[PDB]
């Protein structure tokens, strides 16, 4: 707990990677949760496995008899934590559309994003509910025009688009990481500028290579079990390390707004 | 270089941690090598080998007959690159100094900063030349009321201050990690500004356990060779990346002021 | 260009005007309703709103609008208009005219108001071919958010519109040109500030909202805006730097019609 | 408070006034002097540099000096001082006082020019007990740098010292009062317009420093300090966290003398 030498303390934060990660997926789990006001469903699709794809289908096991997670990299198997939770490959499912009868979901998420699923696929389904996240956060030309999601909500007879932005920050996008890393980043910030602060450490490395390039979601997992900080100060600031990582994880808003039409 | 898709590319900096350690330490030498104004000396002793010190006392060989680092901390013997300086632990240089002829510098120069060399030590050598590093940056109090900075020149015939700042920006201290942290930090907030950008990866560490907890000063100039930042982006940043990052290094400016008498 | 307080140091005001930010916002709204319109011809618009772009945005559907009329709850609002080529309607005057007579029927409506403006039940009184209604929201704030009913007031028209205005990279609350405007200015000083041999910067900045809505002086008000967005105190010339910060800053405003999709 | 455009959206200015954080920060440094002097009385205090802070140090000089004297090349500067117990000079008056008369030797001697201030040469004509510089520099700048000279000011005097104001943890371009007003209010704005339900934040700024130099309007000037230092449209209430934020941000100026050996 001391540094290069005994006049230096370091101090990690409580608060771990994984625990900010599982704030925002908490929050994008309640955010459908609400929005689907209870109904019950007897099969839901989940495109996208990563990374709030695995705890949202999760969440929907009370209300849903079956639930699939539909993942375009079938080593995304590993990430989900619940067998109660059916794994598909894109290409199965697609294969399972096109030979098979037992895909007819009456709820169906799109988590995929920037680069996803194709509004021709979506078209394939005529579910109760269509639920697709929004990956755009605030402003950026170059997000918005590869943006296409109000192009994938083409289906169901309610239509909701699932929205996460930070009050009060700036953030690219919507997504689990880069929300992680913005909270990491602002959390950083303002710790440099408590008394007696030498510098402030993200423990943060691009955490998406590990899953899509090294294909490790073990290593990954195992990564997020880092302290998100890591301080060296002359003074203690044990507390208002973890008092300005939590303020900075409750800004997360995430929410539908329903899209309406006939 | 994509990342979750090919509509999405992953650039990963051509300037990597040591690169912006490199240029650092290099303007703390080139400030030391200003001051001195081109004196010989016979003997060098040079506290506190992490982390300019080494490139720090490897400079002082073309004048200094002898160049000797002292550390408190013996396994920092790994950190020097040169076999032309000569590591003493600090019960030894103690030890010499007490019973011994052999330490008798001309130049010394104070690296350690914070809870480092007492100046009780310092004013047992009668030195040409004595250099200080004031470990102090822009304005903290706790960070002020540790420092004795003013109470170690106490020796020397001249006395100078090394002193580095980033040039509009705002830094806790001048030590080199200090500093590198900060440039990386600042670059990744107008890095992730830039159009098409997604998020931007500070590939940062607590490197200094490395060395001084882990006591493995190989796993740290690995840990050096990793790109500065990561970029998640839509478009190529990789030009205004290595813009960015060289701009936020420029900013680090190197000194020694005089102390006079 | 001159001197501070010795010739040691230089005073810099910028070229760029309060005002000139205000037109380059105004402009970038207008066009962005232009390019929605699509060329469309209408009989009559009615704009709500005259403070701060609809005055212009007003003046901007002369051309395709054979008939613009600006309405607003403030009477001494008319003030604010360039001339006397829009007409001008305090909300007691249209809700009169609405129910007494047959001269109101406009073919185009474009809601400015925002935050707090004109009801959901005044908008369901027009039959318009098009429909626009300004989201005064910006980036994410919920207090914002709650007090927001934008999705509300689309409630006529055969084609519907939200008006959206951000920053591109920068956080801003609202889509309002005085928001915008102060963010603006705000951002620019705090990158200006950084420049070698800055020693403080000046966003010359008041609540001008207030000398419209408080003071009820568009005179004053319009005053206010012909002066420097920002003045500097340097040892070194900034002048150059100065002018392409706030541009660059200026640039970054980003305004859009995005269709409202009703097939009914 | 008041209504906005419409009863939905609120105008809230702040309590604290531009005038309150000149006088915060003045006091400041006032008592960063009063410190460094240690209760010591004196014949004659001489204070070069009316404008910003120099009033109010004159006036707080006046319990321990017998005689306090404010020099400023500018002679409607006299319309600063609020007390007639402070005598004025124009520099002109001074220079010719001391080159035929002998009532001025001043055993006290505080600068507080600063960038393009008084001159070394001037201040050698003195032989005070104690003398004060203002360091103008605060956080690293190389133009500022370039054009300072407090160190080659410290000329005279049995007892040195410098005048430093920083921020705790904020970047300020120099220690003058006008600097560190305009970075409390833009800091604190920069916090306030992140409060829940704010639409934007007004820093009631203008180069006042004009209003005293170029329009050498001292009355003006200090009609327009007593505007509120901040005006704020929001949909809820802030004035609580809007005068906590502005007092923070006040409470992070740090003024004191460090001597000089
Ligand atoms: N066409 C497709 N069909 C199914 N899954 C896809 C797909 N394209 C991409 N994916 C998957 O969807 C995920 C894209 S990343 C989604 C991140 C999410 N918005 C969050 O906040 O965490 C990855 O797991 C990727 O492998
Ligand atoms: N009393 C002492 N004598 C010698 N070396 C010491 C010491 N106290 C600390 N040290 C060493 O001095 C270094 C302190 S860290 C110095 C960081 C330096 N300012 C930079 O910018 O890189 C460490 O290597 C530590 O082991
Ligand atoms: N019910 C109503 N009818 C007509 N005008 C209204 C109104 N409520 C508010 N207004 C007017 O609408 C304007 C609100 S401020 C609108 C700001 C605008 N979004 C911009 O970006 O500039 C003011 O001129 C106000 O007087
Ligand atoms: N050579 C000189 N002799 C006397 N006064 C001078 C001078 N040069 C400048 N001045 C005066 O000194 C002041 C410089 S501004 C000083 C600001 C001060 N550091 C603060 O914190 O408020 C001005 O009043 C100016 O008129
Ligand atoms: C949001 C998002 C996405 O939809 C697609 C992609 O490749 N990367 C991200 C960023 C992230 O995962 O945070
Ligand atoms: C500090 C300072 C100064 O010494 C000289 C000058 O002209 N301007 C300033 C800035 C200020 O007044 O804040
Ligand atoms: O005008 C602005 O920028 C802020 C908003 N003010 C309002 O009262 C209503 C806006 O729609
Ligand atoms: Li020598
Ligand atoms: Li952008």
Redesign the interface.
């Known amino acids: 707990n001391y540094?290069?030498?005994?006049?230096?303390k370091?101090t990690?934060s409580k608060i771990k990677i994984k625990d900010i990660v599982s704030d925002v997926v908490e929050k994008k789990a309640n955010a459908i949760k609400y929005f689907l006001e209870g109904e019950e469903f007897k099969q839901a699709i989940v495109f996208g496995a990563?990374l709030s794809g695995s705890y949202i289908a999760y969440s929907l096991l009370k209300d849903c008899e079956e639930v699939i997670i539909v993942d375009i990299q079938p080593h995304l198997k590993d990430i989900l934590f619940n067998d109660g939770i059916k794994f598909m490959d894109l290409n199965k499912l697609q294969l399972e559309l096109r030979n098979g009868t037992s895909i007819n979901p009456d709820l169906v998420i799109d988590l995929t994003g920037?680069?996803?699923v194709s509004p021709d696929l979506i078209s394939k389904f005529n579910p109760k509910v269509l639920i697709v996240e929004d990956p755009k956060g605030?402003?950026?030309?170059?997000?918005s025009?590869?943006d296409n999601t109000d192009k994938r909500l083409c289906v169901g007879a309610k239509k909701g688009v699932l929205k996460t932005?930070?009050?009060?920050?700036?953030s690219?996008?919507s997504?689990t990481?880069?929300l992680v890393?913005?909270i990491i980043?602002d959390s950083?910030?303002e710790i440099?500028?408590?008394?007696?602060?030498?510098?402030?450490?993200?423990?943060?490395?691009?955490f998406?290579?590990t899953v899509?390039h090294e294909k490790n979601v073990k290593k990954f997992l195992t990564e997020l079990n880092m302290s998100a900080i890591?301080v060296?100060?002359?003074?203690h600031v044990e507390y208002e390390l973890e008092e300005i990582l939590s303020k900075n994880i409750s800004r997360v808003?995430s929410f539908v707004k329903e899209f309406?039409?006939?």
């Not at 540094?3 to 230096?8: C, D, M, Q, W």
């Not at 605030?138 to 997000?143: E, F, P, S």
Request: charged share 30%; proline share 2%.
């Open positions: 540094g290069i030498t005994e006049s230096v370091t990690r990563y920037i680069g996803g605030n402003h950026d030309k170059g997000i025009k590869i932005y930070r009050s009060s920050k700036f690219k996008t997504g990481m880069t890393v913005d980043m950083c910030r440099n500028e408590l008394d007696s602060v030498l510098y402030t450490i993200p423990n943060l490395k691009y998406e290579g899509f890591t060296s100060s002359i003074d808003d309406d039409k006939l």
